[PDB]
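[SOLVED] Predicted holo structure with chloride ion

Edit: marking solved, answer below. Original request kept for reference. I posted the sequence and ligand SMILES and asked for the 3D complex as structure tokens.
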Amino acid sequence: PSVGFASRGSLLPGKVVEGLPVMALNVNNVDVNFFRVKPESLPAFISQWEYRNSLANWQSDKLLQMADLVYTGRFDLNPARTREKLLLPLGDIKPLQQAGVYLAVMNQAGRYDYSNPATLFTLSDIGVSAHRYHNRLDIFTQSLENGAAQQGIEVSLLNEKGQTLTQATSDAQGHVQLENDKNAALLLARKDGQTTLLDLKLPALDLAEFNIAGAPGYSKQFFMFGPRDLYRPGETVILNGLLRDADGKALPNQPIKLDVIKPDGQVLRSVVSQPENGLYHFTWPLDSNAATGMWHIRANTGDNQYRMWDFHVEDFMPERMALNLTGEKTPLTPKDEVKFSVVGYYLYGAPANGNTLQGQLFLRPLREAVSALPGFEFGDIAAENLSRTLDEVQLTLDDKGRGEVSTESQWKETHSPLQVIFQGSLLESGGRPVTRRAEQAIWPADALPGIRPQFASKSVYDYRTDSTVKQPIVDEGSNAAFDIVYSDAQGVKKAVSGLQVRLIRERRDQKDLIENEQTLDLKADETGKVSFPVEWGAYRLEVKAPNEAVSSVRFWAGYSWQDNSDGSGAVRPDRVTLKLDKASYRPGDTIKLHIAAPTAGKGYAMVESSEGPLWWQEIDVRAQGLDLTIPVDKTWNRHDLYLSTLVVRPGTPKRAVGVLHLPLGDENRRLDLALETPAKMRPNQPLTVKIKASTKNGEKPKQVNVLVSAVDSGVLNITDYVTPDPWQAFFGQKRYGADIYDIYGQVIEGGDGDELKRGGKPPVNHVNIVVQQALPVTLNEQGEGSVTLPIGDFNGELRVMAQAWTADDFGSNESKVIVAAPVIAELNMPRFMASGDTSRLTLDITNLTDKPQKLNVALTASGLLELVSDSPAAVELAPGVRTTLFIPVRALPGYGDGEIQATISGLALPGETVADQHKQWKIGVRPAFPAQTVNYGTALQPGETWAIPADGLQNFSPVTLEGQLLLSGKPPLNIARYIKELKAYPYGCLEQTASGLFPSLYTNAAQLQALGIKGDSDEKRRASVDIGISRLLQMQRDNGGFALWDKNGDEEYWLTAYVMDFLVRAGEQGYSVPTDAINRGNERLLRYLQDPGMMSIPYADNLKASKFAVQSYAALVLARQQKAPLGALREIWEHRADAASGLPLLQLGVALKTMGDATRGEEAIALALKTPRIWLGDYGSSLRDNALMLSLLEENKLLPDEQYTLLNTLSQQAFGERWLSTQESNALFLAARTIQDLPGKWQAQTSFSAEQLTGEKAQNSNLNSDQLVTLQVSNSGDQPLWLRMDASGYPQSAPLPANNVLQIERHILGTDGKSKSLDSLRSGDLVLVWLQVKASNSVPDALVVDLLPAGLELENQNLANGSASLEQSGGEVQNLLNQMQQASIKHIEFRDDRFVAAVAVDEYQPVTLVYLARAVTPGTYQVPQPMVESMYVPQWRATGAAEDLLIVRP
Ligand SMILES: [Cl-]
Ligand SMILES: [Cl-]
Ligand SMILES: [Cl-]
């Protein structure tokens, strides 16, 4: 009993019309109404309509207000009881033959439903295909069916408002060139001869199947390069630069502005770089307190289009070993055993003989099985057990440093492609791994079916998994389109017949209901396009190939509440395989292109750039292929040049696109750079690099400049660093500078360092980073030169890198130099040690001589290190043999460094004298517990002095004690942070009305503008107060009391005092309130003081407390008018014990003082500031009451010291409050509106300065323990100064677990999801450390510092290539990972001695954090407690439960 639009397209052709396609079942008569959309403001209609399937009855009023009804036509059909689709004769409708975009709303004759089927369309046989560029836009007009009517004058380009900007004609048969805008919205065709709609708001055609990728530097090229992309905090960043034009040619000496960007996006430093001999060179030191993450240097050549140079800043350890994990290139069959070949070796040139390889084998689905087909999914999504942990790998490499990893197949009957991932960790003799990942593809057949939905993927919430996930969605009652391909691993589409295309409806709340079935035949290099009528709910489209291989994609049918993925539903055109005769072309050459389209079709063939086309027209394509000539022009001096083709053929006219990069990079512009270095060398000796630049036929290397660098391979392998190539930078394939738009897809068919200070001074890491960069040299007449780089005490591999340049000639080369001693003696130690820890250090002595060696190793420990044993080892080593000495050590108490020294004897050298060798290794030591923070804050009056309390810095060790002193002229409470808007609202009930106007009695537009708060004009605000008064007066009852809405309603006792307070204050602020109303109100307030017994508050939990709050408020309002009888006040005072808050007592106190009883008045006020805080009925809270008490004290100019105490308390309460009620923000605004009205100027004389300190804003000053213990500050100003003192450092001993506001707990799980037994921990084990943080109020700036036991090392997730994955190894704690994904995390840091997370937490949302760690150095370790604290409020702090010692076994 339904009828709806089947095509859901935006354009039906004027030729082969057949009207609008409609699918009906048992519906004989259909009433359709057509509406012509108003030409003006048409983009506003499209954005509101969003190309829907149906029209909502309420939302129809707004949408159809910009469209006029032209025809009301009913249509006669003949179905009695099949759901056949049919035509709609539109040719007889004369108003529809006119220009404009139409909307058809159909309904069953006498049916009334919530929504009726609706579609937006245009009747036209015109087919435009626009091309967008950075400045211009070239449109190509055509025609549907047999004919390519190219003439195009009719181009209506409308903006966001809905006004046409330009319209003209050009080129052979017809074409048009127009000015492009950044905020352009539409494009329309023809004045009277039909209309074609094309909008720029829709995503441009997806060219994902085409190689249109490259650098976006179409303008003057600036190649940013350096010796590495990975730095440690405290290192000097080296960056070089060469500026050239679009064709790599030299240009005049111009300055380039460079900015250093932090991971948070803030700039650190800005410089103006000037070139020296055509070379740019930027150097600056990273602070030791620098943030870890992806930093970058951004360059500005002058085009204001930034050039980026990314670099990691991490606590990395250079790799001392190389690990190669190799699978098979070709996918395995489901019957095949999975095998990985392992190769490990020390970079100093020796195999990893006997080294342990620990690892994980995982089974995962291989859905993105063909890289050549991006977006195409392969395999059954409904198939179970495709994600598993296969085995834990534990093996020893042979004498050659070789091994093999294998697992028998446990997926022999799979119909879906799978993958086996080996996450292998090759371990050092100390336990530190070198981790790598290898993947093995498994294919159920040689060719598989692949599915790509043509519809967008939007983020839809799923309450079955309680997590929002982006999934391909389509509107309910609309057809779902899909691209189906039968492809091999390489991407070539194979011919197949008998594909079981099945539309399955998944159970909502029995079994999966098979909705529709199909049979598909595919041709080679053909993309199948299937469309199925979809109803509602969960769906799955599965295609089965005759070889039994099954592939399926899940999709939801329903509503979209915006939240769309950036162009997820973009049109993908059919491919036109374009072939070229030569691999590279030049200005003197002539290109011969073969256009091999799927079928015949007219359109265009051209050469493009980012500034426009260069071969504007070519129109024909005939038979099966077309070889055409393109003469490459001499003025084309750029490498962003591409080729493009378009073909169309009617049956609907199927469109196909072809795109290909035109290579213009000549090989004669490349320098033949040769580097001659020795293959092997000794440490502490200088390395010599012999450079030789040349080129064939020419052989003239005129003034060649060479920049030589040498970096440790163990640094470069972490980020698989590629040697910077200047030829590929300036001449390599640049990105496609165009965007293609066409309508063939819509055609109808039918401070700094402060976080590290809170955690504690990190121990120093003494690792050696071997990096060298010599000055740029000049090569002589022959093109010869030499660079000598001094190499220190390094044992490993060194990568020699060189960059060469002239004006247009660029070269790059690399060579590997092994730096190794005759006998290598290397010590493996943890990253740091804590006080009271024991670590088994390992010393590897390797004989790299051809002769046997006899040595003595003498060991001693200095600093905060001591040897557990004696180790007076006698070492005898045969050629190429390595031994490992176990050196157990203990870390002494305190913060500092430790050292192990080795003096080796009997080193027999050939020819050379036998002399003693010396080696030193340092380790950083720190306490095994987090730092504590002491915080002080006070306002110093002029002349007055502040000194640090004697009991303050007593628990800190002076060595690590650091502090921060912030001085300012304004209080720490910033009202703009809590109040963004302050506007009058004179409507609603009695409470709402008074609450929307109370702040409006005191502020003004000038004050709000100075505060940075949005408000009303003074005129609007005053008019609103007057409206509110007149409304409130109508709620006054005959007894003078006030009701909630009407004068006849029940009396509201607290609100009567509230509204009376408002109305009396309104009078003092220049507003008129009738005298009779005030008198009646005051008479009623007097009844409250005299008669609390007649008060009916039945919902009150504490009736006496409620009655007391009413009387005290009534008392203050009458006393401010000198109308409160002292007898009544004294009798209310006798019941003071009834108060449940300080506010009623402070109000009563002010009343007693005002009316004459200063003794009882001062007693009440003093009692109020000691009394802590429908339910109570007073609409109150602690926050509100503290702000009202503050205004009361200020207003009555009493207890200024108590005012400063409440102001600091308020600042912390506002900070910790999720949302503020109207009365809280009102009270807070009124208490803090006068503090920013004072200047920020301040003066102070301090203990740490001989010169006076002055400023106009808050100026921080870092302090050391000498300064802090004698810290004294004096106010030398005429205004009060505000000081904040934060001191941090390790205590002398470990404190006990404590918590205030915040809560933290730590638990360690194994990768099996079970609790890990902290004794049964072995060197190499991966563990999941789980933190849970809770809070009794909002902590927007919580800093989680989890100091590690020295035996645990973090798996740095930022350096994915060199570490184990949290995602892959955390499958058994997916609940915890999902909880963590929901947390608001500012940043996460994987440091040497700690895990750090900056997070927001509150009472309704506990935070879950999970991190992956590895047990490395064997020993017995102290476990520091987990810590969490607020940066702004350091008193919001928690230390988790004390844990048992951590034992790491060998
Ligand atoms: Cl080991
Ligand atoms: Cl006030
Ligand atoms: Cl802060």
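OP edit: The longest strand covers residues 853-863. Thanks to everyone who chimed in.
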